[PDB]
From Swiss-Prot, chain A:
Source organism: Homo sapiens
The protein, known as: Isocitrate dehydrogenase [NADP] cytoplasmic
Disease / disorder: Glioma: Gliomas are benign or malignant central nervous system neoplasms derived from glial cells. They comprise astrocytomas and glioblastoma multiforme that are derived from astrocytes, oligodendrogliomas derived from oligodendrocytes and ependymomas derived from ependymocytes.
Oligomeric and partner information: Homodimer.
One GO MF term: isocitrate dehydrogenase (NADP+) activity
PTM (free text): Acetylation at Lys-373 dramatically reduces catalytic activity.
Classification of source organism: Eukaryota, Metazoa, Chordata, Craniata, Vertebrata
Record-linked NCBIfam families: nadp_idh_euk, PRK08299.1
Catalytic activity: D-threo-isocitrate + NADP(+) = 2-oxoglutarate + CO2 + NADPH
UniProt KW keywords: Acetylation, Cytoplasm, Glyoxylate bypass, Magnesium, Manganese, Metal-binding, NADP, Oxidoreductase, Peroxisome, Phosphoprotein, Tricarboxylic acid cycle
One Pfam short name: Iso_dh
Site (Critical for catalysis): Y138, K211
Cofactor(s) needed by this chain: Mg(2+); Mn(2+)
Residue list for modification Phosphoserine: S388
Length: 412, 411
């Protein structure tokens, strides 16, 4: 009779074809059933340029205040984009910026449809990657070494005691490159807690990967912190659910994951999580069918995003009124994951039911054979797909909407 | 009369535990009956590395520079438990890391494929060869704990006496943590590029380099720029003539594209990525342990072929108690065959070249005929379904290879 009152959500609008899909999702799938107190931040490239990227920081601050953010894919400028949009600077990726402000762990997991074939034969249960969202390469200082000379890294305590100087390399034959990077104890502790809690929440074992055989001090610190927290705070809960936590060397881990059946949480350092989550998503059948949710250290704030790109080539055709077949699932599940968290915070049973029903309809629709071109290509091979094998962007969104209406009405 | 092949000079690095047992069996049953060698042997077992404060590892690397061919048995890389088990003077670094740091070059890794061993990744009908840059980055880094608030900086002091340059790494104001510095060398990157372009041209396959230059714009940008300059100026015409190409890819794009591909390309990897992704790729072809690993040095004349991965401690303990084991020797065998094949190339030795290939063929044919160790039978049937009649123990398998090798060499 009346729409679900859904509460406060921070929306981060994006670019190009994902921006188009984003507005379709709202128009056809969300707003006909849900009324929201939407706090909207335009992270389009033109508004980021207009505001000297201030809108991105304001959006992150709004997520802290309202505890739920949902983010559309954005352009990370390069030189070509600077020329295309006459940018004032080559602005940094909003995702890096938001993650650095909020902190936490990005959990990434495939979105699985029975008729979309896996590439890895054994993966019959899901693999959830928890990517530490702070530090390491993403805050590093790198530079070109122009010629022979010495590179050192130093630590000067703030409390006035004596410095320590570590030789990096004496460049004796030429130049090269060098870099320093760091991470913080508290961030690592938050990463550990989020990983143990996720594993207990799903009832799956947890592995952390490092390369502490080589980086005995840097990666040893991750290994040590996880083990201490596990022993003192989570081990008895794990044993009660008959699950476990173990550290693994990263190269052992990627091979162990390859040969596994799935069904574990995989805690990754920032870089490894960035890389391995794409490998895993592709192994489940489609790189694009993936959820990506930043879980912040306060245990109450979340940011759900559509991972990967803005699909520029489809946007160019759309702008010319040409037919496209853009997969909206990752954008839809950014909304449903955000709304499901909003519902849990508010004990809003109607919104929780809605968010889960939309995820069900999305998967059921694809499983009934209605699907965009990229998914049909998973089944038949891309050079072999014909027009009758798939739905265009609007046909697919319309089929979702008609299936969502049926699902919500049947439950009433 | 009856004669053996005159094989020439080879540097041998002996190793630890079960791989050491297998190593000696390979020489005794498979190499020495057919090949005479000028063997320059270095004991890289954990006890002798400790006794020499790791000097033997350096001596062995220097011997490879002299004789241009090394073959290496798997070695223990000590952890806390190994330090206690052998009362070590230090948690010594991996010998492979030390040797690679001394020799430099590119480590090429590739699956050893048997028709009856199923892949885990559906589309991989052709091989993926990873060229792992073998020098620098995380494997020569300096890392440390930050015990509390304070400033970490990194500074460059030019040799020529001009003014030093200092960059702020991090101001720790809320606690402690960790930090590290790493580096790489232009000349080493250039050698890595040359080896990668030459390997692609020798195979007739395209070449991809992965980096994360979106994030490390100077450090990884330097890899990208050196590769592109060397390509444009020295190899692009030859690539186009063979209808292949070179392209840079972001590492997270590359791992997904690799997993969705059919194979058939060279994948140039920075040290860390090559270490990690070569294990993923070998496992994806069916068996982590079936892989070749050959360090190709920058001089274009020196190689070190290694048995990659572990020493199979659990089998070694069983062996020490007189219990039956089923230890796969293929990776150790192919270290010898790849080393001898390069030796044959340097010396223009057709007999040695024929032998090295024959041993590889015998190894593959034997497994494809249904004679293998337990690990491989588990690839086919699933470990819970493997019975004794599904496999050969360690000595039965080596003897089967011996008999098939004798037959093959009788043309
Ligand atoms: N690095 C990326 O990937 C990211 C992309 N961006 C921007 O997005 C724009 C374009 O990016 P691009 O690389 O051009 O990819 P795109 O999204 O166009 O997809 C290529 C082809 O895949 C097919 N395809 C893709 N999606 C769909 C779909 N939904 N439905 C159907 N087909 C699809 C289609 O195929 P076709 O049908 O055309 O044959 C398309 O063309 C640039 O501004 C980037 O900055 C944003 C963030 C990064 C993040 C990290 C970060 O910076 O914060 C990241 O991942 C990393 O770097 O770590
Ligand atoms: N490198 C060195 O390797 C040593 C240990 O490495 P680790 O990481 O323990 O891996 P291991 O080399 O010890 O192998 C561990 C397990 O994998 C199986 N396995 C490994 N290699 C073979 C083989 N060649 N044939 C058959 N089965 C095999 C065995 O499984 P199972 O025991 O189930 O047969 C073994 O117990 C370390 O000390 C390190 O320094
Ligand atoms: O070198 C080591 O420490 C173990 C061997 C290894 O990791 C490898 O061969 O890839
Ligand atoms: Ca990425
Ligand atoms: Ca390794
Ligand atoms: Cl359309
Ligand atoms: Cl035996």
């Amino acid at each position: 009779s009346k729409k679900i009152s859904g509460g406060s959500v921070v929306e981060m609008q994006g670019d190009e074809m994902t921006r188009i899909i984003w507005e379709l999702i709202k128009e056809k799938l969300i707003f006909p059933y849900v009324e929201l107190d939407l706090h909207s931040y335009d992270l389009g490239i033109e508004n980021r340029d207009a505001t000297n990227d201030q809108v991105t920081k304001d959006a992150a601050e709004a997520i802290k205040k309202h505890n739920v953010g949902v983010k559309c894919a954005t352009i990370t400028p390069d030189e070509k984009r600077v020329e295309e949009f006459k940018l004032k600077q080559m602005w940094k990726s909003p995702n890096g910026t938001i993650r650095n402000i909020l902190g936490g762990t990005v959990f990434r997991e495939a979105i699985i449809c029975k008729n979309i074939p896996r590439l890895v034969s054994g993966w019959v249960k899901p693999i959830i990657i928890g990517q530490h969202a702070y530090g390491d390469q993403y805050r590093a200082t790198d530079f070109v070494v122009p010629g022979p000379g010495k590179v050192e890294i130093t630590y000067t305590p703030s409390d006035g005691t004596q410095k320590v100087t570590y030789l990096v390399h004496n460049f004796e034959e030429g130049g090269g490159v060098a870099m320093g990077m760091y991470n913080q104890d508290k961030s690592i502790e938050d990463f550990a807690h989020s990983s143990f809690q996720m594993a207990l929440s799903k009832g799956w074992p947890l592995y952390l990967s490092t390369k502490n055989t080589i980086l005995k001090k840097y990666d040893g610190r991750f290994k040590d912190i996880f083990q201490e927290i596990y022993d003192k705070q989570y081990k008895s809960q794990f044993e009660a659910q008959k699950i476990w936590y173990e550290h693994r060397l990263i190269d052992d881990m990627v091979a162990q994951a390859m040969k596994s059946e799935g069904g574990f949480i995989w805690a990754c350092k920032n870089y490894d999580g960035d890389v391995q989550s794409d490998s895993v998503a592709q192994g489940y059948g489609s790189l694009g069918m993936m959820t990506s949710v930043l879980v912040c250290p306060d245990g109450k704030t979340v940011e759900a995003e559509a991972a990967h790109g803005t699909v520029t080539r489809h946007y160019r055709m759309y702008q010319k009124g040409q037919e496209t077949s853009t997969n909206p699932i990752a954008s839809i599940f950014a909304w449903t994951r955000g709304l499901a968290h909003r519902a849990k915070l508010d004990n809003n049973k109607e919104l929780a039911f809605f968010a889960n029903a939309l995820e069900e309809v999305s998967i059921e629709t694809i499983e009934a054979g209605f699907m965009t071109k990229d998914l049909a290509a998973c089944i038949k091979g891309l050079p072999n797909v014909q027009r009758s094998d798939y739905l265009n962007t609007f046909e697919f969104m319309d089929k979702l909407g008609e299936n969502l209406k049926i699902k919500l009405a049947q439950a009433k």
